[model samples]
Target chain A: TGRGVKYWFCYSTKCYYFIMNKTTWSGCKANCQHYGVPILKIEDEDELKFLQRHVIPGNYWIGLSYDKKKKEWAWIDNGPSKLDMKIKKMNFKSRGCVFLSKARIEDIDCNIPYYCICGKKLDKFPD
Target chain B: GRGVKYWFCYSTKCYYFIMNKTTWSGCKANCQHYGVPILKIEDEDELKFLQRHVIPGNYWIGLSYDKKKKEWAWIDNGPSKLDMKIKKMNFKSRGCVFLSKARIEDIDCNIPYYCICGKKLDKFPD
Candidate 1:
């Protein structure tokens, strides 16, 4: 494979992002599946850096969620040892999907259309 | 990451197979999404061994397809590999997929619901 495959985003942790070219939410899901990767989501700064390097300046879909039961935004991987909470507000509903609002963060409804970020297994890829 | 890591299938070619739990077409699609591996297939003997260990008797599944035109045989990755063919009367019609026929071989209909296998990349689960 061409080494031009850039590290679009990275987190200080171990995770990173492999941002897909412009595509719909459904398209994004399919693309991730074909590439043998899961849908993207940001959980930490390392993941954020991996993404920031690849993303353009704007809103994008992330792997965040709007917890319907808790009625607040939270990381899907919410636990002390897991991903720390990235969103602080409950500005949206539909608690499943995640997205990046500007560079900071945002939790939007799942029905809404937006770009996305797919997580990459950094160490797994050969150098 | 947790431990209990197991190696499912491995070939000299460096690819491996990771089987999945029981699931339907849509469910299979979803499970593979979460794990992220292409559908399972017996690309080589290693894969076959991995599958044999996991599969039950009487017809299971695999990732194969029927070519409408080629009419009697060919691997999806045709042209210099798998080099397997038989004047061996098709066994049956619907020629666009692969399956383990009674521990030997069989080409059944796609309409028939069988099982499948998925591939996985080996990792250091620390």
Candidate 2:
């Protein structure tokens, strides 16, 4: 594993920006983009485990959220999610953004401030 | 519980990496003294996680030969599918497991090495 937090942590095939500082969902979107990785869209259970292990135990926002225009909970990037995360049925439509717990995902109003994780595939490794 | 020292723990388990070199039994005794279990790799990915985080040294994990049972078992003395996943268990040369990179091998339990401790967090930190 390459060891340089050039502002983000790199492990395996992806580089992650675990922004532990609090921010709203939209604010996280901007922050992630600023880091050159955008918010996390967990690709698999392995990725989920990696993120959960590293993030300072907090509710960190991923890229998933409720899209008012499409009327569905989708990743902010509008891509497909691989993990079959069973979000509580009650929260399916009640909220417009999702944050991660150590064990599961939950939805809430996106305006509420929370920490976030941003990630992108490692095109190049930091020295 | 809060994360251990510099390393973070999450979900159900927290791991503590001990930099001090010690024997397999020493590693076991130290963690138990702290009321924690030895490093128990839950899956192949978890194993990879451990392999990645270590600072390049053989660290004693929670796997070893249970002479009474005549089989590989975790520190809890419970049987594991992880043994089957490992494939190259060195069934002939048996003692304890040391993890380095993507490889896992068995050596004399008396061999001194670094250690990793794991524990089930009754309450994960928020």
Candidate 3:
């Protein structure tokens, strides 16, 4: 079956899927859900390195976004993020999504069409 | 201070991934030569992070069997935070342990493998 993402790489307990085609933040989120994975949530710089090592520079939407309602930045799973993005909610109007790259993690406008990276923790082992 | 190539410094702590394969004692000696503790996995997340970067090879960690005490323990004498159940660990039949991929398996101490050594960084990386 054809899917939104075309490439995937397994690193230890998780596998990240990538789609080169550009899509809005929500659009990419929907695609990952449809594929049974969610947008990537980084645990640390080392985990981020796995994503960075396999990728070139691009605007890639991760699972993190700012919830204007909650007045907080959060991962898609509602777990607390170890990363401190230093985002200020005072001037920002649109929903903020995090874009990951090898050089840095930057906050970006959510409506922008960007590449996607999705991932899942392993529930089963490869035999 | 070690070269940047072998040492992976993360803020205050650093890890040395020894690409050269050697026996468990040999590798442990190398870390001791540097006055650092052998790698002691503190959490599942830490092991997963190491698994991501360990260059696809088995590496000697800090845990090993103590035949005199009839127990398995870490070299640092600190408890492991990760849930290393380690069923059927021949514990075979008394051998050294190495982390390979997702599994931590035991082999004779003389068996050769890579190394993971750790220490506190004097300063931090930006």
Q: Second chain TM-score per prediction? A: 0.42, 0.83, 0.81
Report how far off residue B113 is in candidate 2 (Å): 0.3
Q: What local distance difference test score does each model get?
A: 0.42, 0.72, 0.72
So what's the TM-score on candidate 3? 0.49
**How many clashes show up per model?**
26, 1, 2
lDDT of 2 by residue, A28-126 (tens): 888888756789888887778766776667798889888688777788678776664544344566657888877767778898888888877644211
Task: State the DockQ, from 0 to 1, for candidate 1.
Answer: 0.01
Give the residue spans of candidate 1 off by over 4 A.
A1-27, A66-83, A86-96, A123-127, B1-126
Tell me the tens digit of each residue's lDDT in model 3 across A1-127: 6555457656545666787878988988999897778988887667877677668678789998888888877888998545544334223345678887777667778988999988777553222
Off by over 4 Å in 2: A1-127, B1-7
- Give the Cα error of residue A82 in candidate 3, in Å: 2.1
Q: Name model 3 segments beyond 4 Å from true.
A: A85-94, B1-126
Q: Model 3: clashing residue pairs?
A: B89-B92, B90-B93
lDDT of 1 by residue, B1-126 (tens): 121222222221122122332223432344244453333343455335534554453223333334555443332333312224322424454433434532434444333333443433334211
Candidate 3 residue-wise lDDT, B1-126, digit = tens: 222226553323567777777888877888877677678777776777778767788999887888888777788876776635554334564777888777787789888788888764342111
Residue A62, model 3: lDDT of: 90
Candidate 3 chain B least-lDDT 10 residues: B1-10
> For candidate 2, lDDT tens digit of each residue in B1-107?
12232233433456667777889988888777666778888787778767777788788989887788687788877655676776564455479988988688888
